[PDB]
Amino acid sequence: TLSPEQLVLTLLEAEPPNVLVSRPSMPFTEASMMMSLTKLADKELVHMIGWAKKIPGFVELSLLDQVRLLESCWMEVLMVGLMWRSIDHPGKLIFAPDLVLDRDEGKCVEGILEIFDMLLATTSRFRELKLQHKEYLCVKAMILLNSSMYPLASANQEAESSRKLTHLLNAVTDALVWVIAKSGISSQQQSVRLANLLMLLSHVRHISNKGMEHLLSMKDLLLEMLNA
Protein backbone atom coordinates (compact mmCIF):
# COMPACT_ATOMS: atom_id res chain seq x y z
CA THR A 1 0.00 0.00 0.00
CA LEU A 2 2.54 2.62 -1.16
CA SER A 3 1.81 5.99 -2.77
CA PRO A 4 1.29 6.84 -6.44
CA GLU A 5 4.48 8.95 -6.36
CA GLN A 6 6.35 5.93 -5.03
CA LEU A 7 5.06 3.76 -7.90
CA VAL A 8 5.81 6.35 -10.58
CA LEU A 9 9.30 6.90 -9.06
CA THR A 10 9.93 3.13 -9.23
CA LEU A 11 8.72 3.14 -12.88
CA LEU A 12 11.12 5.95 -13.89
CA GLU A 13 14.02 4.13 -12.18
CA ALA A 14 13.05 0.84 -13.86
CA GLU A 15 13.32 2.25 -17.41
CA PRO A 16 15.67 0.10 -19.50
CA PRO A 17 18.80 1.61 -21.02
CA ASN A 18 18.20 3.01 -24.53
CA VAL A 19 19.55 0.30 -26.93
CA LEU A 20 21.92 1.71 -29.55
CA VAL A 21 22.04 0.04 -32.92
CA SER A 22 23.23 1.56 -36.16
CA ARG A 23 22.00 1.22 -39.67
CA PRO A 24 24.03 -1.37 -41.57
CA SER A 25 24.98 1.66 -43.73
CA MET A 26 24.62 -0.50 -46.85
CA PRO A 27 20.95 -0.41 -47.82
CA PHE A 28 19.16 -3.74 -48.11
CA THR A 29 15.60 -4.84 -48.83
CA GLU A 30 14.08 -7.66 -46.83
CA ALA A 31 17.41 -9.10 -45.75
CA SER A 32 19.26 -6.43 -43.76
CA MET A 33 16.35 -4.28 -42.62
CA MET A 34 14.76 -7.16 -40.67
CA MET A 35 18.16 -8.51 -39.63
CA SER A 36 18.98 -5.25 -37.79
CA LEU A 37 15.39 -5.11 -36.44
CA THR A 38 15.71 -8.66 -35.11
CA LYS A 39 18.98 -7.79 -33.31
CA LEU A 40 17.45 -4.69 -31.86
CA ALA A 41 14.41 -6.52 -30.49
CA ASP A 42 16.53 -9.28 -28.99
CA LYS A 43 18.66 -6.76 -27.10
CA GLU A 44 15.49 -4.96 -25.91
CA LEU A 45 13.84 -8.23 -24.80
CA VAL A 46 16.84 -8.95 -22.54
CA HIS A 47 16.27 -5.59 -20.79
CA MET A 48 12.46 -6.13 -20.85
CA ILE A 49 12.63 -8.96 -18.35
CA GLY A 50 14.81 -6.90 -16.03
CA TRP A 51 12.34 -4.04 -16.28
CA ALA A 52 9.29 -6.32 -15.72
CA LYS A 53 10.80 -7.60 -12.50
CA LYS A 54 10.86 -4.05 -11.12
CA ILE A 55 7.16 -3.32 -11.76
CA PRO A 56 5.53 -3.15 -8.32
CA GLY A 57 3.85 -6.44 -7.48
CA PHE A 58 5.12 -8.33 -10.57
CA VAL A 59 7.56 -10.55 -8.65
CA GLU A 60 4.85 -11.31 -6.10
CA LEU A 61 2.96 -13.09 -8.91
CA SER A 62 3.67 -16.81 -9.39
CA LEU A 63 6.38 -17.51 -11.99
CA LEU A 64 3.70 -19.15 -14.17
CA ASP A 65 1.81 -15.82 -14.26
CA GLN A 66 5.03 -13.83 -14.85
CA VAL A 67 6.04 -16.03 -17.74
CA ARG A 68 2.57 -15.85 -19.38
CA LEU A 69 2.30 -12.09 -19.05
CA LEU A 70 5.65 -11.53 -20.74
CA GLU A 71 4.98 -14.12 -23.49
CA SER A 72 1.81 -12.27 -24.56
CA CYS A 73 2.76 -8.53 -24.23
CA TRP A 74 6.42 -8.33 -25.32
CA MET A 75 5.57 -7.00 -28.83
CA GLU A 76 3.07 -4.48 -27.40
CA VAL A 77 5.82 -3.36 -24.97
CA LEU A 78 8.34 -3.05 -27.80
CA MET A 79 5.81 -1.16 -29.90
CA VAL A 80 4.81 1.34 -27.27
CA GLY A 81 8.51 2.21 -26.61
CA LEU A 82 9.01 2.72 -30.40
CA MET A 83 5.93 4.92 -30.43
CA TRP A 84 7.20 7.04 -27.53
CA ARG A 85 10.65 7.36 -29.18
CA SER A 86 9.02 8.47 -32.46
CA ILE A 87 6.44 10.73 -30.96
CA ASP A 88 8.20 14.05 -31.75
CA HIS A 89 9.12 12.92 -35.29
CA PRO A 90 6.21 12.85 -37.71
CA GLY A 91 6.71 10.38 -40.51
CA LYS A 92 9.55 8.37 -39.00
CA LEU A 93 9.92 5.32 -36.69
CA ILE A 94 12.85 5.85 -34.35
CA PHE A 95 13.73 2.23 -33.62
CA ALA A 96 17.05 3.42 -32.05
CA PRO A 97 18.81 6.80 -32.12
CA ASP A 98 20.98 5.63 -35.01
CA LEU A 99 18.23 3.67 -36.76
CA VAL A 100 15.57 6.07 -37.97
CA LEU A 101 13.38 4.71 -40.71
CA ASP A 102 11.15 6.92 -42.79
CA ARG A 103 7.65 5.81 -43.71
CA ASP A 104 8.45 4.84 -47.31
CA GLU A 105 11.48 2.66 -46.36
CA GLY A 106 8.99 0.02 -45.19
CA LYS A 107 8.35 -0.87 -48.83
CA CYS A 108 11.51 -2.94 -48.67
CA VAL A 109 10.00 -5.67 -46.44
CA GLU A 110 7.07 -8.00 -47.22
CA GLY A 111 4.00 -5.84 -46.62
CA ILE A 112 5.22 -4.00 -43.54
CA LEU A 113 4.14 -0.55 -44.74
CA GLU A 114 0.56 -0.96 -43.55
CA ILE A 115 1.96 -2.16 -40.20
CA PHE A 116 4.32 0.87 -40.22
CA ASP A 117 1.32 3.10 -40.92
CA MET A 118 -0.59 1.65 -37.96
CA LEU A 119 2.45 2.46 -35.81
CA LEU A 120 2.74 5.96 -37.18
CA ALA A 121 -0.95 6.69 -36.68
CA THR A 122 -0.90 5.38 -33.07
CA THR A 123 2.23 7.50 -32.59
CA SER A 124 0.36 10.52 -34.04
CA ARG A 125 -2.54 9.97 -31.56
CA PHE A 126 0.00 10.10 -28.74
CA ARG A 127 1.54 13.25 -30.19
CA GLU A 128 -1.89 14.78 -30.60
CA LEU A 129 -2.67 14.02 -26.98
CA LYS A 130 0.73 15.43 -26.02
CA LEU A 131 1.50 12.22 -24.02
CA GLN A 132 3.75 13.10 -21.05
CA HIS A 133 6.69 10.86 -20.00
CA LYS A 134 5.11 9.95 -16.64
CA GLU A 135 1.79 9.03 -18.40
CA TYR A 136 3.72 6.90 -20.80
CA LEU A 137 5.35 5.05 -17.85
CA CYS A 138 1.99 4.12 -16.40
CA VAL A 139 0.65 3.05 -19.79
CA LYS A 140 3.59 0.72 -20.46
CA ALA A 141 3.30 -0.89 -17.00
CA MET A 142 -0.44 -1.31 -17.63
CA ILE A 143 0.28 -3.11 -20.96
CA LEU A 144 2.36 -5.71 -19.03
CA LEU A 145 -0.17 -6.19 -16.22
CA ASN A 146 -3.34 -6.22 -18.40
CA SER A 147 -1.77 -8.80 -20.74
CA SER A 148 -3.84 -11.81 -21.67
CA MET A 149 -2.39 -15.06 -20.27
CA TYR A 150 -2.41 -18.22 -22.37
CA PRO A 151 -3.18 -20.98 -22.17
CA LEU A 152 -5.83 -20.48 -19.43
CA ALA A 153 -6.03 -22.25 -16.07
CA SER A 154 -9.30 -23.34 -14.59
CA ALA A 155 -11.93 -20.70 -14.17
CA ASN A 156 -11.15 -20.78 -10.39
CA GLN A 157 -7.36 -20.52 -10.79
CA GLU A 158 -7.80 -17.72 -13.34
CA ALA A 159 -10.05 -15.81 -11.00
CA GLU A 160 -7.34 -15.83 -8.34
CA SER A 161 -4.79 -14.59 -10.85
CA SER A 162 -7.23 -11.87 -12.04
CA ARG A 163 -7.94 -10.60 -8.53
CA LYS A 164 -4.23 -10.10 -7.93
CA LEU A 165 -3.52 -8.55 -11.34
CA THR A 166 -6.56 -6.27 -10.84
CA HIS A 167 -5.13 -5.11 -7.51
CA LEU A 168 -1.85 -4.25 -9.28
CA LEU A 169 -3.55 -2.52 -12.20
CA ASN A 170 -5.54 -0.39 -9.69
CA ALA A 171 -2.27 0.86 -8.10
CA VAL A 172 -1.07 1.84 -11.62
CA THR A 173 -4.40 3.57 -12.39
CA ASP A 174 -4.11 5.48 -9.10
CA ALA A 175 -0.65 6.65 -10.17
CA LEU A 176 -1.84 7.61 -13.67
CA VAL A 177 -4.84 9.53 -12.15
CA TRP A 178 -2.37 11.32 -9.92
CA VAL A 179 -0.06 12.10 -12.83
CA ILE A 180 -3.05 13.43 -14.77
CA ALA A 181 -4.28 15.56 -11.86
CA LYS A 182 -0.92 17.43 -11.78
CA SER A 183 -1.72 19.15 -15.11
CA GLY A 184 -4.51 21.02 -13.34
CA ILE A 185 -7.19 20.37 -15.96
CA SER A 186 -10.75 20.05 -14.83
CA SER A 187 -12.30 17.00 -13.34
CA GLN A 188 -14.21 16.31 -16.62
CA GLN A 189 -11.03 16.69 -18.67
CA GLN A 190 -9.13 14.37 -16.29
CA SER A 191 -11.60 11.53 -16.92
CA VAL A 192 -11.57 12.13 -20.67
CA ARG A 193 -7.74 12.08 -20.61
CA LEU A 194 -7.68 8.88 -18.53
CA ALA A 195 -10.05 7.37 -21.09
CA ASN A 196 -8.16 8.66 -24.15
CA LEU A 197 -4.97 6.96 -22.94
CA LEU A 198 -6.67 3.71 -21.89
CA MET A 199 -8.53 3.40 -25.24
CA LEU A 200 -5.23 3.44 -27.15
CA LEU A 201 -4.35 0.28 -25.23
CA SER A 202 -6.76 -1.62 -27.49
CA HIS A 203 -4.99 -0.11 -30.53
CA VAL A 204 -1.54 -1.22 -29.25
CA ARG A 205 -2.98 -4.76 -28.71
CA HIS A 206 -4.42 -4.79 -32.24
CA ILE A 207 -1.17 -3.62 -33.86
CA SER A 208 0.81 -6.21 -31.87
CA ASN A 209 -1.53 -8.96 -33.00
CA LYS A 210 -0.99 -7.91 -36.68
CA GLY A 211 2.76 -7.50 -36.24
CA MET A 212 2.98 -10.99 -34.74
CA GLU A 213 0.97 -12.53 -37.58
CA HIS A 214 3.04 -10.54 -40.09
CA LEU A 215 6.34 -11.73 -38.59
CA LEU A 216 5.08 -15.33 -38.46
CA SER A 217 4.01 -15.31 -42.13
CA MET A 218 7.58 -14.43 -43.14
CA LYS A 219 9.06 -17.02 -40.80
CA ASP A 220 12.02 -20.74 -23.02
CA LEU A 221 14.85 -19.20 -20.97
CA LEU A 222 12.46 -16.65 -19.51
CA LEU A 223 12.69 -18.27 -16.06
CA GLU A 224 16.50 -18.31 -16.23
CA MET A 225 16.50 -14.54 -16.76
CA LEU A 226 13.54 -14.17 -14.36
CA ASN A 227 14.98 -15.92 -11.28
CA ALA A 228 18.47 -14.40 -11.60
Q: Applying CB under 6 A, which residues contact ligand RAL?
A: 37-38, 40-42, 44-45, 78-79, 81-82, 95, 112, 115, 211, 214-215
Of the residues 2, 213, 218, 223, which one makes contact with its own copies according to CB under 8 A? 213
174 is a contact residue toward its own copies (CB under 8 A):
yes
Give me the least distance between CB of 14 and its own copies, in Å please.
21
Give me the least distance between CB of 192 and its own copies, in Å please.
5
DSSP assignment, residue 190? H
C-alpha–C-alpha distance, residues 75 and 78, integer Å: 5
Of residues 161, 133, 130, the one with CA closest to residue 146: 161
**What is the H or E stretch that residue 102 is in?**
strand 99-102
DSSP assignment, residue 60? G
- 45 touches, from ligand RAL, its own copies, none (C-beta below 5 to 8 Å by class): ligand RAL
Q: Is the Cβ–Cβ distance between 132 and 102 less than 8 Å? A: no
141 is a contact residue toward its own copies (CB under 8 A):
no
Contacts of 185 (CB under 8 A, 6+ apart): 193
Nearer to ligand RAL, 45 or 181 (CB): 45
C-alpha–C-alpha distance, residues 13 and 149, integer Å: 27
Nearer to its own copies, 30 or 158 (CB): 158
Nearer to ligand RAL, 96 or 179 (CB): 96
**What does the per-residue mask of binding to its own copies show for 79-98, with x meaning CB under 8 A?**
-----------xx-------
Helix locations, 97-220, DSSP H:
113-129, 133-145, 155-181, 187-216
Of the residues 99, 120, 131, 137, which one makes contact with its own copies according to CB under 8 A? 120
